[PDB]
Design a binder for this molecule. Structure first.
Ligand SMILES: CC(=O)CSCCNC(=O)CCNC(=O)[C@H](O)C(C)(C)COP(=O)(O)OP(=O)(O)OC[C@H]1O[C@@H](n2cnc3c(N)ncnc32)[C@H](O)[C@@H]1OP(=O)(O)O
Ligand SMILES: CC(=O)CSCCNC(=O)CCNC(=O)[C@H](O)C(C)(C)COP(=O)(O)OP(=O)(O)OC[C@H]1O[C@@H](n2cnc3c(N)ncnc32)[C@H](O)[C@@H]1OP(=O)(O)O
Lengths: 211, 209, 210
């Protein structure tokens, strides 16, 4: 459920979705929220402060303790079957963040498309750190306390090591990324949710990654 | 504290304090042991499964620990150890042991497991099995230190603020820091009290020299 | 506030807000000054000992600071500096200073002390004595930055998110980030307002270029 103030906000949250202990605050005009079926979005605080903002959460998404701040003309899209523990998402500068299907974001994530303040080059006075969209691909696992900064695109089927800060995009899927700066530390892997399988062949969710 | 199951044994001696702490035990044939003169406050401790062993020796002070133990796991914290806020997770039937007279600053994360599997595409095998963590006697973890699976810390070691350990170390009496974690100083001993000018003023340090 | 001891002085301007902030001073000869138009809110500030100094100039905004000062220590924060949630600890009779118009994001941990001694086996002597921290003018600390003892930060520097500083830098007008912390960008100046087109549009930045 939610607290909505302004003109022509559209909030459509499926009746099959649970929103226990969550604060959804929409302050402004022409904002739109869609939450799909069989979601569990609990103990969160989602704030849309501005105009023309979009939040889209697909089916079967489970979120616990997300603190999310969206400003005018920004967009957050989270695709189906993604799960997220406690963390923070911040979108400004009329930008966007997208998180793919069947991602797994462990406690302590911080994801942002913006530094929130300008840096200028002394060579010409011009701003050099404009906001840039973040794209997290399908089936990405962010370990604990991962930080994803502006402009970063993460390929499909990637694991990001605990405590890693990503400043730059990667192109290689099926790898583990860790260190500073962040780099590929292992290639040719696939991760899964349940650790009771002899091999990957026992997890029917993984077939697409190896077939 | 909250118990659902049979043949669970819980001995929390008095002389020891558990103010504002939640203990939940779901399962059977589990054992919780907290020694004398311990301080276990504002913590949330969960045991779920069977034949789990939680052992906290005498003279232990823990404030704000979140601890999760799964079936057939064991956590052992030896005497004199002090701990601030942090997290310990044990799974995959493994164990974590923390030696005597350790000093763990706020922010610690200790676990023997990733909680999820990573397989090789090359042979389909899981490659990140859980492994025991052994933290030696008289270890100081600075703020926000992360100790991951399979790591063994020698006796009398300082780990620098915000360091993450992925690998074991063999050298005692050292300071460890950086990324990757590295020995950055050798032949030291730490103590708890700044007012002790020299290691000779601190009777607790006799054994390390 | 709560104050115990003799010759303790506490001057908090009438024009400053201290909502939800607890201030505790225990000892003798301690001095607290908070200047005009400050907002020092939801903070926990403790002075315990003798001859301690807390100086916070005009137009400083602080939210969620946990600050601990021991005997003969001093903390000085100059005008127009803003600080989110964080921790500052000063012991061993040392000093921390934060210059004018700094911007510290939530999560800072700043200390001049390790709080616990490390001794050399060779001679039994303590070898991690506390050292003073100096953060220059117009320093921006990104989220969750840690500044350890002895560190001096030059004027007009940005420190990147989750960076740990364990040693001093001398280059101004740069961005420092990574582990180990290093200069990753030179010849810059940061400002507060994303709405501005260029550095020239922000009159507070005039003193840093030309
Ligand atoms: C209950 C409690 O446990 C409360 S205590 C928590 C509050 N205190 C802390 O977390 C302690 C903060 N201090 C530190 O982490 C210190 O680095 C510790 C671990 C205490 C060690 O201090 P010291 O023995 O004084 O050595 P320190 O100068 O820090 O570093 C030794 C070398 O290791 C380097 N180093 C330190 N941190 C580094 C890093 N992060 N990356 C790379 N190098 C690093 C230093 O630059 C130095 O190099 P050199 O001088 O030999 O060329
Ligand atoms: C203070 C307040 O009141 C509120 S602020 C709190 C919210 N905002 C934040 O925490 C800011 C988050 N942003 C950052 O940390 C950014 O990195 C900052 C520090 C702002 C810098 O932004 P920019 O000037 O755009 O730097 P950027 O180009 O991304 O720097 C990348 C360069 O420096 C490297 N780099 C950046 N961070 C790095 C890192 N951690 N490790 C290694 N390299 C790093 C990049 O790989 C790249 O190198 P190259 O391309 O020159 O070879």
């Amino acid at each position: 459920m939610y607290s909505e103030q302004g003109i022509n906000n559209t909030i459509n949250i499926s009746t099959t979705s649970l929103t226990n202990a969550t604060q959804l605050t929409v302050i402004g005009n022409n904002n739109s929220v869609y939450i799909g079926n069989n979601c569990k979005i609990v103990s969160s605080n989602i704030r849309l402060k501005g105009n023309n903002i979009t939040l889209f959460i697909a089916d079967d998404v489970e979120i616990m303790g997300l603190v999310c701040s969206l400003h005018s003309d920004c967009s957050l899209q989270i695709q189906a079957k993604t799960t997220m523990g406690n963390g923070e998402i911040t979108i400004a500068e009329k930008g966007k963040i997208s998180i793919g299907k069947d991602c797994m974001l462990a406690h302590g994530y911080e994801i942002r498309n913006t530094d929130m303040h300008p840096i200028y080059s002394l060579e010409n006075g011009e701003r050099i750190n404009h906001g840039k969209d973040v794209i997290i691909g399908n089936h990405v696992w962010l370990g604990r306390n991962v930080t994803i900064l502006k402009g970063v695109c993460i390929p499909n089927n990637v694991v990001v090591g605990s405590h890693t800060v990503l400043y730059k995009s990667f192109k290689e899927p099926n790898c583990v990324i860790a260190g500073s700066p962040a780099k590929i530390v292992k290639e040719n892997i696939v991760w899964g949710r349940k650790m009771y399988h002899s091999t990957m062949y026992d997890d029917p969710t993984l077939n697409e990654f190896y077939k």
